[PDB]
Amino acid sequence: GHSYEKYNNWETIEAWTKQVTSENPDLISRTAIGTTFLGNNIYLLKVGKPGPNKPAIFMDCGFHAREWISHAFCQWFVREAVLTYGYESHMTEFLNKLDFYVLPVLNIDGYIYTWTKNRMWRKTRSTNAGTTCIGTDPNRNFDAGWCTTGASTDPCDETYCGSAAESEKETKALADFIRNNLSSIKAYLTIHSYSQMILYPYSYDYKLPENNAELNNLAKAAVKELATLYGTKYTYGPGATTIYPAAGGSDDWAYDQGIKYSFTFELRDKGRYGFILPESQIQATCEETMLAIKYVTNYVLGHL
Ligand SMILES: CC(C)[C@H](NS(=O)(=O)c1cccc2nsnc12)P(=O)(O)C[C@H](C(=O)O)c1cccc(CN)c1
Numbered sequence: 518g519h520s521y522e523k524y525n526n527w528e529t530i531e532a533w534t535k536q537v538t539s540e541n542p543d544l545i546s547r548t549a550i551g552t553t554f555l556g557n558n559i560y561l562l563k564v565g566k567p568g569p570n571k572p573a574i575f576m577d578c579g580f581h582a583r584e585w586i587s588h589a590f591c592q593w594f595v596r597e598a599v600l601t602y603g604y605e606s607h608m609t610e611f612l613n614k615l616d617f618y619v620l621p622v623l624n625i626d627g628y629i630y631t632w633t634k635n636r637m638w639r640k641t642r643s644t645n646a647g648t649t650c651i652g653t654d655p656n657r658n659f660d661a662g663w664c665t666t667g668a669s670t671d672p673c674d675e676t677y678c679g680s681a682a683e684s685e686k687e688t689k690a691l692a693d694f695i696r697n698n699l700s701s702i703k704a705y706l707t708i709h710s711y712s713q714m715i716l717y718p719y720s721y722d723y724k725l726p727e728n729n730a731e732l733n734n735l736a737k738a739a740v741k742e743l744a745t746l747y748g749t750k751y752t753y754g755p756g757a758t759t760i761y762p763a764a765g766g767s768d769d770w771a772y773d774q775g776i777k778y779s780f781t782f783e784l785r786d787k788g789r790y791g792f793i794l795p796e797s798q799i800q801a802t803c804e805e806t807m808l809a810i811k812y813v814t815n816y817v818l819g820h821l
């Protein structure tokens with residue numbers, strides 16, 4: 518019961534990750550980088566023509582449970598990658614020279630919760646000591662300026678930074694994988710909604726990254742490319758000044774690990790529907806986003 522033009526529940530996404538791997542065993546392999554608080558496998562797909570010691574780009578979706586278009590996009594990306602490999606020259610070059618690590622849904626427990634009990638949930642669903650309030654904000658749970666500006670120490674708050682950095686099994690798993698694979702990963706892309714933005718470091722402080730001038734030009738070019746299809750307008754810049762400070766983010770943590778091309782995407786829209794983006798907009802949203810991801814990928818290959 519899977520569709521690329523509808524939002525799919527976790528049972529369906531899980532089945533899809535196995536399906537797309539089985540159909541394309543020579544281009545895709547699947548692993549589980551860990552388990553969620555509730556015991557669900559956290560899947561990662563490795564998309565590319567297999568080879569020794571290839572560079573890689575890492576992309577995840579579904580950090581935040583309610584941001585359903587994010588999850589939708591990782592699925593769209595994988596189909597497009599397989600469908601156009603061997604057919605379109607650029608994607609064919611891409612998957613020959615590098616690997617894509619695609620993590621379709623990080624916060625699986627929260628996503629299940631938005632389908633069963635509360636469409637507007639954001640955090641994980643781990644329990645907290647001493648309170649009935651549930652969950653930690655995964656994008657405040659990484660070891661980058663942890664629990665300083667833009668995060669809450671209150672477990673009942675939506676930006677609760679957690680009992681400690683990487684306290685959540687899900688974020689521990691992601692950080693672990695990246696650490697173990699640091700030599701290969703040239704870029705980190707993390708998909709959110711909404712607001713139509715491309716963000717880069719820093720978010721935990723107002724200081725600018727060493728390669729600020731390069732990241733700004735790249736984001737500028739990427740939003741230009743995105744707009745070419747349907748005229749969708751993105752803003753861009755350092756996280757802290759471009760939206761608000763948010764310490765403990767995975768893009769900042771990836772960057773300070775040495776991954777110099779680290780971007781957060783905020784997809785459609787700009788508040789008309791917000792997180793409840795109509796299914797009729799999924800295809801158009803994913804198509805234009807593909808153009809930006811491919812632009813950044815082509816850039817990375819030329820700047821290894
Ligand atoms: C609507 C977008 C902007 C989400 N922010 S939100 O907390 O859900 C939110 C929704 C509605 C109104 C709001 N006012 S302030 N935050 C709001 P986000 O969750 O995707 C933003 C993301 C985060 O808060 O983790 C983010 C903010 C700043 C910087 C970065 C990159 N590290 C990421």
Ligand SMILES: [Zn+2]
Nearest residue numbers: 581584709710
């Ligand atoms: Zn988000």
